[PDB]
Symmetry: C4
Subunit: 384 residues, 4 copies
């Protein structure tokens, strides 16, 4: 005999747990990253337009969208930072330039006037928010003072391995000298690295080592971590201290953004996805495709603007303007949250942590099935 349909919801209670895995079950198949798993769908009872994407950048800075442009010389100068802020995220201006040049870029962002209600602006002056990267040697103290004079809102201490005495000393010096400046420390991939930087006074952490599209650190240094695993393990610790984390590297699509946030990230940082856009630095050139250069900051070319390279110089295809691309990401992330059944990124965090949001692993065959497969040809047009 068959069960009565009227009892179907009640019958769920006979199972020991919800279908799929909790995030803890998932992350206990070690060394995973984003492509190794999926989020299972939930219950839809609201429109995607309802989904709020407010996200913490640092202890005191919140954005309307979890999107941060990388401090790379082929990704973020003033044009990128202005437009990222207008669209609800933020740009981190690179430091492969003189201190005077970098301060001028920050000034250009801070003085911009020409906006939507989601724009990233200071609460007092209503100027666009601006970030910038620096190193952690003594000369960077004067560089930072110039950036602060230019109106900097947040500084990123830029390193492939941020758990160093130099970086710790720089965090302490900044918190003493410029107490109102928010500091993002990193990069980190372990709980121990995170503890060290948090203890030094970081207002946020940048997570990732070797995941970048242009990065060869794992090959040449043998050192790094799979990105999803790094995000989970760092944020499981950092989130207890109210220290928001940026998932930096290895993001190529909306689903990576969703997954990074599911695993504990507060924001996501993009280099390659934003390289090749109109607002990135560098000129377009042709090959019969329209291209831009995109290069690691540890590439020989970037370092020269024996040397051991930790990144490569390459090219990416023209992506058009971020005035279309960022709204695509935003709308896509709203739709992703809707499918999962959550109405905000705050709720997404809460429901992952409670075990309400469920996950599944993907075997290599499942990854192939999940991608485009068994066509003679196709065009992958992502948005209109």
């Amino acid at each position: 005999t068959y069960r009565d349909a009227a009892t179907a919801l009640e019958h769920l209670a006979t199972y020991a747990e919800k279908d799929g895995l909790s995030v803890e079950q998932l992350m206990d198949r070690g060394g995973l990253t984003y492509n190794d798993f999926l989020v299972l769908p939930g219950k839809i009872d609201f429109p995607s337009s309802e989904v709020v994407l407010s996200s913490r950048l640092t202890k005191k800075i919140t954005l309307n969208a979890p999107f941060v442009s990388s401090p790379m010389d082929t990704v973020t100068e003033a044009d990128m930072a202005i437009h990222m802020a207008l669209l609800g995220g933020i740009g981190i201006i690179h430091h492969n330039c003189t201190a005077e040049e970098q301060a001028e870029m920050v000034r250009r962002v801070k003085k911009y006037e020409n906006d939507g209600p989601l724009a990233s602006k200071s609460a007092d002056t209503k100027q666009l928010l601006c970030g910038a990267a620096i190193g952690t040697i003594d000369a960077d103290r004067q560089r930072l003072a110039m950036l602060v004079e230019a109106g900097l809102d947040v500084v990123v201490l830029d390193s492939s391995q941020g758990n160093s005495v130099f970086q710790i000393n720089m965090i302490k010096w900044i918190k003493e000298t410029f107490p109102d400046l928010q500091v993002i420390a990193g990069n980190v991939v372990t709980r121990e690295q995170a503890a060290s930087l948090i203890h030094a006074g970081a207002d946020g952490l940048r997570i990732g080592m070797g995941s970048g599209s242009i990065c060869i650190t794992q090959e040449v240094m043998a050192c790094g971590r799979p990105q999803g695993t790094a995000v989970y393990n760092v944020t499981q610790f950092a989130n207890q201290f109210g220290v928001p984390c940026i998932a930096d590297g290895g993001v190529q699509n909306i689903g990576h953004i969703t997954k990074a946030i599911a695993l504990g990230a507060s924001t996501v940082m993009m280099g390659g996805m934003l390289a090749g856009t109109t607002e990135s630095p560098g000129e377009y050139f042709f090959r019969g495709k329209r291209l831009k250069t995109y290069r690691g900051m540890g590439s020989i070319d970037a370092m020269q603007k024996v040397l051991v390279a930790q990144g490569v110089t390459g090219s990416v295809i023209d992506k058009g303007s971020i005035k279309k691309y960022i709204p695509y990401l935003y709308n896509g992330l709203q739709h992703s949250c809707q499918d999962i059944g959550v109405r905000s990124l705050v709720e997404f965090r809460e429901k992952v942590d409670s075990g309400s949001v469920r996950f599944e692993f993907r075997t290599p065959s499942a990854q192939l099935e999940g991608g485009v497969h068994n066509l003679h040809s196709y065009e992958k047009r992502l948005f209109d």
Copy 2:
């Protein structure tokens, strides 16, 4: 000393279990799909022509073959639906057209006269059975009323994520308003989604999220499930309620059909396998191959007949007529059942559930060995 051959069958009883895995052992290596495993052969004591492929589409509709054509605008209009029904399966007419156009397609199927004893026909009028897809917004109520007037037998509520209040409300409205119309709800991939739709009144479920050959939902939404795992987990629940399930997406060959049914599906739905056949919509074009367009219903092109695409536009090679292709699938499935040792799909279900039918995982090397390998060249001619 060696054992006496006369004792060989008796000696089987000394083992703790049958060789290979039960379906429960298999599905406990998480995130698997069809290519990750095989069914082990059994005992042959009947001809393949003996195998019966009768399959439940919905609570009240049974087909002579477990084959359902997808409601896509490059797969199923009236020609496809007519021929699928003549061959013992069914077509689901797409809704990327006006309600009047869709009702005319249904009418054409219902009025067709020109048949084999396996044809899918109504028990009272002996008209070919016809299905059709609709959405779940308010305008779809009037669309459905027009399709019902045209003689529709089964409606498919068409969504990538069917566990929504809109779809639940539509199921309830249909069951009240058109009590004799069978309703297939979905798409679903979890037990909880299935419970929700069954409780609302669904007569069948459509299983799958992201497995389609033209689908990029997993990449862009981070949300979906490996198809084999979805089929198993949904049907383990749904089958208890006597709610038949369609395994939709990711089917490319006869073995996927066998595996879908082994894992609990009652029928299988095909888009890509049927695209490029004579009876599909759209014209052939050349490139030096003869091709047809095959596109996701969430492709920019289909949606336009910012937008976030969940499918792509592509092409597939000419497959010839389903008048040859469906008999190939049918005969092939008979042979597959024969190898496994089962005389009907009902028996296949029973013997999987009892642990008589056994399975084995396949490592990536085993998958390569199982495919064509180590030839200079080959032609893959599937049937004569």
Copy 3:
């Protein structure tokens, strides 16, 4: 302080077990085949020329080399069977021909005169040994009687799924009617299939389903087994009855032969490795490579000499004469045994079963490392 070198052998006794895995530990990572593991080296205290490769084909037939040519119409006619026997193995003549044609091929082998001390010959007449394949329908009774009149030594009952009532009845009929004829039954991949055929009276078993280079049975039927796993599980049972097994399909190189024997096979059968040799049937043709056709017996082309194909038609490159190729395999297998530390295939079996021979799994990265890697170009010249 460091340990004294004089104690190093004694120190081995402090470990719980030998380094690496026993075959039981290996085969408990389910669904493996040959490329998934390696045999660990042992102690060399003899020359490779000492290694004896005597192998049981059936209960009453032993060969000097474990090499059997497949009964395929692009692999074994009389020329192949003659030369295989002269070199210490055997050929199985195909049956895609009339009974009169097949009997003439057998007669040609049995009447050949023109030899090395390892040649496969009958003990009474000193004629070359010959095998032949038949089907298991009623017409095959008269075919077999003609082959027996021609001097056949061993018959192979040819099927992709040999556990059938037709094959069981044929085994029983042969054992009654031609009691001195050795019968190899199959193909099988499970313990239960093996028990059924052994109980019927088989003198040997042919193991494999879907592993053949030209075979698509796993794709189209969903039914088969990874070859290494099939060999282990069938032979673990069959060897208890003194029923030798042929590991048939998926062999491409000497290491596959070693691994097949390690896992319990008594002999190995080759199609693709022997196709394209001078002694195989069919003419060479050019494309700018010299090629031969190699095709599955379930290909449309072979069957035609709706139809559901279970194999493909392809091509392989010219391999030269088996007068060089078989001695390469023989010498290579001697060297492989030497590396492992065993002086005969009998000893190899004994030392695997006792846990003296050890194994290791290979991750995909380990397989890539084990192959040729990181060269601009290379030539893979296997022998001089």
Copy 4:
């Protein structure tokens, strides 16, 4: 409420263990090699220039860098050995030449005069250190006597499978006859092989079987081991006897060197990485790339300077001079140690063994993320 940042280091003590895996947890996912895992970063509190790379070659020979050039006829003759020693490593001169020719090569190294403070030199004469390979048959006794007369410092007994009575007898004869000559035995991949050679009197071991870029031993012999697993398991035993081990084969980049040492190796041997350099034997030729031949010593070509090949002949691209390449490796390894948080290779060993250094597995997706990914094109320029 959030935890106080001041407590972050203290909070680490609430976890059961450090983040990531100990080497024992890692090596318990069997059959792994270098690309399957990463080393997690530590704490940086020193400059990379502080890192010392002193490494034990044998019981009595220590080098300033862990780099050994392979005894192959396309890698190491006198030019390579001279320059390797000048740069702090050592060369092993090949023996595919007459004894007189080989002795002349050794003499050329020992008589060289033209140096940095890291040069590998004898403590008494201050001559460059030189190694050489020999076989283990009787004729090699006279060959070795000639090499000793020429001033040889270390002999490598050259075999793909060194656990043989011939090699054991050769070790014993050398230790008796030339007691001041250091002997490296091998190749080995198991604990049992290592015990046998250590007991015979080896001063060092050469680890690896089948991992070489030009090697096909695993394919043809079915015998070998994944390199990382071999290094771990051999050295776990050998290091207890104070017998240093060379990780030979499968090294392509700095990270493989780091990983080999992490797993217990004392030095690393390179063939392919050093082939194609100015100092390797053989002339450059063009194809529109500048190339050199690089070939296995078990290739038909090398053996001919039936035969069963265990290696291939190929080509590699011009790498320039080792006067730049070795300093790249040295500086890179210093940077790798810095990221991990260790100031010497001795410290690296100690901190791996204590569980302070942590590791992580990498799924195939994590390996793809760790490599260069999702670029239109790129150039992989490793150093300036």
